[PDB]
């Protein structure tokens, strides 16, 4: 019922996927007791900046004490989870950018915390603050009182002034990997009692592109389409991507100058009902992958295991120069595709151009 | 607990200040000879010691013994100034108080004599954030100041100040704090803190500081936490790698050396960071263009890129001019075709591949 | 109270839309199961019906009977939404409210409970050009909106949106409607309005619509207004300049043989008669594509174009495939640069003159 991203959040340091280096530093600091007064989190979207920062606030103000493993059951822990903790002040810098708001904030730091050990200020999207706002925080951030901590999260830290950066410890998160995303999806779906297939999850993880919020958003969409099931057929239709076998087969026909087979594949593709831009993109993608493999054997990834041997033989046979000619020819065709009378006409003419200028077997030229 | 390295290890004497000889020497001579101005301006890079020197100068003037270049550091005045609860010393954060309404109240009480000090010193931090009216009010009171008050100004943007105020004060421009000087201070702090360290770890941190000593302390504190109470070369090297942003220069070096594995590794880590691939090509083009001009004239490279001057110089000497032209031309073609590539990541990889091997065949 | 077809025939139920079956199926399943999301994003080409689907979705959420995928259309909430004066349904024209201060005022409004309906839908249209500050303001509230607020977004160019905002909403990409779907819809609308029409006339209008149903209705009104209240093949052909029998074929034959006098005379005669220059290039491109197909396989040519079958086959046997590509490329450039030429006729003459130089 509830959104997966909102329902499933890390309530403990053990529930976060990846970002081990950041967690190790935080755990060591709390255990040793060398606690700073200004933390800056950076990274791409959906990496867990807010989730990590919220967890850190729980540890500092936990009833048991300053620990790297919050209990999650005391009054302070549960209130922070609900987002209604008095000593946890969260500021939306995007909606509070004027210096007047910033000066109001600085007039409250002096007062002691109500019940918590520390008064933690969590500023989200801090890169939106005005130039005058940064300088207002500049002096107090260097020497805060003993009972205040500042947590900052920003997607683009390059916008912040150089002076602000030097006053805080900066942790840069990294984009999650395909395997990490896949494992998390398996755990979530299994806990949700929803069927799934191995291939469907791989496609969702690949489409996430280094983010976990994206994967969860796609998963919610996929569940609705499949009526409570996540099948490979449903996901493939949703992403609007044809299986690599069809695309690879078309490329194999093109290189061998088998025009009749190429026309047959196009007719089948037309019956399938897939955008003609997708076909060119996939054909370009495979040709690029062949070039990368030809550069180094390790270029090929684990995802394309089903057609590993088919691409390897193509790289061995086709010279590097021929790959360049085919790759560039499709790029020019993609540029001129919008101006063609019809999408089928544009794509078909592009392929005929490649066959006409085939390096070894051109079309027969009449006298 | 354990405080912070920056806050804990504040300089407390002219001897503790690292470098800045051309500033401390002038101040010591002035105080000893009695030739003291009314307005002092401090300018320099961030975290270079502008505020620290200002407080030391204020403490020396107001010390019980007299106007001495070396404050005793033990009398009541010295300790109160260090603790920041001294009545005759007024510290103002100009950044948080920009409107002229607050400035007038501050400047009203300049006529009154100091309560317990020889001089009443006003310390203004980030003075470059004062409105137009505030500068006028400050200029009015600064034109004819009483003999029993002094004004100390600290800022990193002297350009924003009006020319009128600049002409009525002596300005000291603090210099970048070298490289070895930062290393020596870190070694002194660590052993005094009973923390293990290695020569390699300190050198890496010193270079990463880039002339700012506050940055070195912040990195040093982070390294200690990562190393679990120790500063090892392994832990420090891993931490710096996570914060590297010099991918573009690394790509050019790998591109010239023709190392396919090195180029792909750089791309993979760059993707993990989340860099914009369009930006990456633009900055690489700038580096290639800059290197070409350096070959034409040795003076084409300015001080704006002193951090990587040595690496840039080496490329110019070794790479023949023709190779630079070919690489620059190939990247121009790649940028034009990037929008129509199957993906931005793939577009950069393909263009780099054409840079390593293959060359275009021009007409005729 | 006369209103044009594009405004009169807006869908009022899911069953009344054309195509977009995958989008409707996904939405219907979600409402039935109960997996209701916070933010929805609809993207696609112009005239596909992003606003129509979004408005229908709002009706189902706030319907009196319940959260269903088949709005009744008779209850008080349904009718008011159709009229466009429903208190809870707040519609924002992002094209005219780019100012950040407008967005900030909106955020402060969401804290209040809905007046009558059980949801407070914020339908934002043309959201692809808000100021950067406006987008960043929505991030915090859009991530975790209150229980009783929903966000519906519509855009034509989602590339301009920041990556952060996209990650927080479900994306539904709509495809351009097929020619057959457009033709069927036009025939249904005209039949309901009791307006005479012909088979070929609908085909020409659907073909020129280029997958946009909004454009198809606009052309239909233009034809009706100038067609004396009826749609006829001669009226539509006169509306958009269409070559009759062999106007394009004769021109390309002269171009291939590189005969300057014939090409200029044909252009001059065509200009005097008066035709659409863009249409001339499109037909010339079509013939070249057909000739290329014939070279690949003699059976590619269709039986419908049997009037000029002999002439086209002769060209295929005489011209190498490579030269056909050059002519095809040149005409595409001419169409690309035609709007930017000093005169439409002048641009065409430049295009033909360039092609005449290819022949040895």
């Amino acid at each position: 019922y509830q959104v997966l991203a909102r329902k499933w959040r890390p309530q403990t340091f053990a529930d976060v996927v990846g970002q081990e280096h950041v967690l190790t530093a935080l755990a060591n600091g709390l255990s040793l007791g060398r606690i700073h007064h200004a933390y800056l989190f950076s990274g791409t979207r959906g990496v867990g900046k807010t989730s990590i920062a919220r967890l850190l606030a729980k540890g500092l103000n936990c009833e048991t004490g300053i620990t790297a493993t919050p209990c999650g059951v005391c009054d302070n822990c549960r209130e922070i989870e609900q987002g209604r903790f008095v000593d946890l002040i969260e500021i939306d810098a995007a909606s509070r950018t004027k210096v007047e708001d910033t000066r109001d904030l600085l007039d409250n730091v002096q007062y002691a915390p109500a019940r918590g050990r520390f008064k933690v200020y969590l500023i989200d999207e801090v890169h939106m603050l005005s130039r005058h706002s940064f300088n207002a925080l500049l002096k107090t951030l260097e020497e805060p009182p003993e009972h205040v901590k500042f947590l900052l999260a920003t997607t683009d830290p390059q916008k912040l002034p150089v002076t602000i950066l030097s006053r805080c410890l900066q942790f840069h998160l990294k984009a999650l990997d395909v395997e990490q995303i896949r494992h998390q999806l398996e755990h979530i779906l299994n806990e949700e009692h929803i069927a799934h297939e191995p291939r469907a999850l791989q496609l969702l993880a690949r489409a996430a592109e280094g983010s976990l919020r994206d994967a969860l958003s796609l998963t919610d969409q996929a569940i609705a389409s499949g009526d409570g099931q996540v099948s490979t057929q449903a996901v493939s239709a949703m992403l609007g991507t044809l299986d690599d076998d069809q695309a690879l087969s078309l490329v194999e026909a093109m290189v061998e100058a088998n025009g009749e087979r190429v026309m047959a594949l196009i007719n089948e593709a037309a019956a399938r009902g897939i955008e003609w831009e997708a076909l060119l993109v996939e054909m370009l993608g495979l040709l690029h992958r062949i070039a990368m493999v030809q550069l180094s054997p390790a270029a090929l990834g684990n995802d394309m295991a089903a057609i590993e041997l088919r691409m390897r033989e193509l790289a061995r046979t086709i010279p590097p120069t021929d790959i360049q000619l085919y790759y560039q020819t499709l790029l020019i065709g993609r540029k001129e595709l919008p101006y063609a009378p019809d999408r089928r006409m544009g794509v078909e003419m592009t392929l005929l151009r490649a066959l006409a200028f085939h390096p070894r077997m051109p079309l027969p030229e009449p006298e | 607990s354990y405080q912070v390295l920056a806050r804990k290890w504040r300089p407390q004497t002219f001897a503790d200040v690292v470098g800045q000889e051309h500033v401390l020497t002038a101040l010591a001579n002035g105080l000893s000879l009695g030739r003291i101005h009314h307005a002092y301006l401090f300018s320099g890079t961030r975290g270079v010691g502008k505020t620290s020197i200002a407080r030391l100068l204020a403490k020396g003037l107001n010390c019980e013994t007299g106007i001495t270049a070396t404050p005793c550091g033990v009398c009541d005045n010295c300790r109160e100034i260090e603790q920041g609860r001294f009545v005759d010393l007024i510290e103002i954060d100009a950044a948080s108080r920009t409107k002229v309404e607050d400035t007038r109240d501050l400047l009203d009480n300049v006529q009154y004599a100091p309560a317990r000090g020889r001089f009443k010193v006003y310390l203004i931090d980030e003075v470059h954030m004062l409105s137009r009216h505030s500068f006028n009010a400050l200029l009015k009171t600064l034109e004819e100041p009483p003999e029993h008050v002094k004004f100390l100004l600290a800022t990193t943007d002297p350009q924003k100040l009006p020319v009128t105020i600049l002409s009525r004060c002596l300005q000291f421009h603090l210099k970048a704090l070298d490289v070895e000087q930062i290393r020596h201070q870190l070694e002194h702090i660590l052993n005094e803190e009973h923390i293990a360290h290695e020569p390699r770890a300190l050198q890496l941190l010193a270079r990463a500081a880039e002339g700012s000593l506050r940055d070195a302390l912040s990195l040093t504190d982070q390294a200690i936490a990562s190393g679990d109470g120790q500063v090892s070369t392994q832990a420090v090297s891993a931490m710096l790698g996570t914060l590297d942003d010099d991918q573009a220069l690394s790509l050019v070096e790998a591109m010239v050396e023709a190392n396919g594995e090195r180029v792909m590794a750089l791309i993979n880590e760059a993707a993990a960071r989340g860099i914009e691939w369009e930006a990456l090509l633009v900055e690489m083009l700038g580096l290639l263009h800059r290197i070409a001009m350096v070959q034409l004239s040795p003076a084409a490279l300015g001080n704006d890129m002193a951090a990587i001057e040595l690496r840039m110089r080496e490329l110019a000497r070794t790479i023949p001019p023709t190779d630079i032209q070919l690489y620059y031309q190939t990247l121009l073609i790649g940028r034009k075709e990037l929008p129509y590539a199957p993906d931005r990541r793939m577009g950069v990889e393909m263009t780099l591949l054409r840079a390593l091997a293959f060359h275009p065949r021009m007409p005729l | 109270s006369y209103q044009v077809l594009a405004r009169k025939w807006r869908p009022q139920t899911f069953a009344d839309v054309v195509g977009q079956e995958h989008v409707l199926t996904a939405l219907a399943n979600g409402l039935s199961l109960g997996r209701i999301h916070h933010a929805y994003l609809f993207s696609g080409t112009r005239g596909v019906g992003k606003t129509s689907i979004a408005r229908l979705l709002a009706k189902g959420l706030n319907c009196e009977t319940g959260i269903t995928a088949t709005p009744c259309g008779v209850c008080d909430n349904c009718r008011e939404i159709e009229q466009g004066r429903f208190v809870d349904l707040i519609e924002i024209d992002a094209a005219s409210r780019t100012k950040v201060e407008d967005t900030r005022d909106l955020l402060d409004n969401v804290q209040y409970a809905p007046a009558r309906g059980r949801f407070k839908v914020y339908l934002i249209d043309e959201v692809h050009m808000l100021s950067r500050h406006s987008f960043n303001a929505l991030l915090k509230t859009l991530e975790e909106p209150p229980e009783h607020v929903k966000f519906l977004l519509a855009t034509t160019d989602p590339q301009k949106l920041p990556v952060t905002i996209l990650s927080r909403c479900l994306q539904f990409h709509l495809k351009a409607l097929d020619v057959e779907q457009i033709r069927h819809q036009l025939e249904h609308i005209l039949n309901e309005e009791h307006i005479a029409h012909e088979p070929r006339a609908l085909q020409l209008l659907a073909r020129a619509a280029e997958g946009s149903l909004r454009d198809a209705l606009s052309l239909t009104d233009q034809a009706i207004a100038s067609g004396d209240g009826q749609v006829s093949t001669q009226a539509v052909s006169a509306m958009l300049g269409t070559l009759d029998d062999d106007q394009a074929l004769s021109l390309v034959e002269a171009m291939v043989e590189a005969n300057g006098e014939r090409v200029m005379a044909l252009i001059n005669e065509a200009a005097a008669r008066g035709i659409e220059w863009e249409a001339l290039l499109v037909e010339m491109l079509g013939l070249l594509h057909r000739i290329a197909m014939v070279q690949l396989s003699p059976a590619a040519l269709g039986n419908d174009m049997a009037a000029i079958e002999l002439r086209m086959r002769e060209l295929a046997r005489t011209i190498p495939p490579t030269d056909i590509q050059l002519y095809y490329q040149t005409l595409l450039i001419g169409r690309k640069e035609l709007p930017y030429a000093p005169d439409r006729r002048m641009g065409v003459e430049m295009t033909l003159l360039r092609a005449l130089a290819f022949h040895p």
């Binding site: 493999v293 030809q294 550069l295 180094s296 054997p297 790289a315 061995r316 046979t317 010279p319 590097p320 120069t321 360049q324 000619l325 560039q328 020819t329 020019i332 200028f357 | 023709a258 396919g260 073609i333 054409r354 390593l356 091997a357 293959f358 060359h359 275009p360 065949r361 007409p363 005729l364 | 490579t322 590509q325 050059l326 490329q329 290819f358």
Partner: peptide
């Protein structure tokens, strides 16, 4: 020059000729 490359030049497609075969690590053939 030849007609093939001239037509490709007019068609807007560039030809890439291998320069450092040692860079490629594989059975390029």
């Amino acid at each position: 020059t030849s007609r093939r490359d001239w037509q490709l030049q007019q068609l807007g497609i560039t030809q890439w000729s291998l320069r450092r075969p040692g860079a490629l690590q594989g059975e390029i053939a």
